[PDB]
Amino acid sequence: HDNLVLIRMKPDENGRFGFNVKGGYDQKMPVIVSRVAPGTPADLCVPRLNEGDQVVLINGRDIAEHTHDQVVLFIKASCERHSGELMLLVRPN
């Protein structure tokens, strides 16, 4: 489904990736990357996570019908990362 980019990133010392999320099922909007802070894992990873990117999969899980809070919990769920890297399948826009 469309052009998809597979992104892998390890969190910092505070367990942060340096990116912001907007949208979700409850918000009636898609899960979009609203901000990417400079010099953070989301900014330094290759391929890069960009602003406006639509999150499709989080560690292989389909988040289409999930709420904003559920999406946040999935991102923070360190045990679901293989192997210690957060996997994100995104659609650039």
């Binding site: 990736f17 912001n20 907007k22 979700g24 904003h68 946040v72």
Partner: peptide, 6 residues
């Protein structure tokens, strides 16, 4: 318009 820093 909920926004969360992760």
């Amino acid at each position: 318009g909920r926004e969360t820093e992760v």
